[PDB]
């Protein structure tokens with residue numbers, strides 16, 4: 001039922017997948033008030049129209065679902081990037097914009113988030129120069145000609161404490177990943193993994209994790225064959241020991257349909273064979289089910305940067321991992 005889209009968000013409790021936002025070609029954004037719910041057990045869709053402080057229609061936003069409470073940060077609306085923070089209690093649904101304390105992150109999109117205890121921990125993204133902070137920001141030289149305000153990538157780590165809805169920045173040790181956007185984040189225990197992403201002229205192949213207890217960065221160097229570097233991929237925990245990688249976009253502008261699992265305990269990648277080899281996706285979403293499956297929705301089958309030829313999808317791809 002839902003219309004095709006890329007750059008949407010999809011979050012889940014393992015049974016119901018909530019889809020919001022994104023854009024398509026016919027860069028018209030999809031209706032801001034619509035919240036699509038996909039039942040992973042029955043395969044049925046349901047649309048509900050939300051009220052309250054409905055966020056602007058956006059692509060590249062960052063969302064999480066914790067105890068059936070939906071949190072949304074950042075994104076790109078018709079007038080640029082944002083750093084607003086929204087909440088939707090899904091337990092008539094009403095959005096609520098939270099006026100957080102502390103210094104918020106810079107306005108940006110295409111980032112990632114880890115969830116650990118009371119903390120939402122955001123990393124990276126693409127957006128405007130920080131108006132103020134810890135980390136590094138690198139301008140995208142091409143942004144000075146295609147836009148009113150220039151933009152760049154960051155390697156910032158920001159915590160939102162949901163106990164007080166206060167922003168802060170942790171003091172991290174170790175070598176942080178370079179600034180990036182369109183990377184993929186995944187959390188298992190107190191480890192926030194990040195893989196790939198776009199930085200300058202490369203879509204990268206490196207894998208790191210941030211210890212969310214000690215705030216120490218670690219680079220992971222798996223031995224043997226590793227997936228090609230990419231952006232606009234998904235990285236989804238499917239167990240306490242495996243992360244599922246699917247899709248994305250290479251430095252060479254190749255849409256990707258390969259799937260892998262990263263085994264955390266063995267520190268190796270395992271390529272996953274599946275029936276969607278002719279169905280590459282970039283800027284899709286991926287959500288894990290309680291039954292071990294990974295549910296991919298939306299995204300684009302070809303180079304979405306050629307807008308007038310972009311092949312956005314509304315297909316559900318089910319990976320039984």
Ligand SMILES: CC(C)(C)c1ccc(CSCC(=O)NCc2cn(CC(=O)O)nn2)cc1
Nearest residue numbers: 027110126181182198203231249304305307
């Ligand atoms: C309007 C139209 C539909 C044509 C459209 C335009 C632009 C975009 C995004 S491109 C601009 C940008 O924000 N560049 C920084 C960036 C990119 N990436 C991902 C990667 O390049 O792999 N990570 N950081 C998408 C659609």
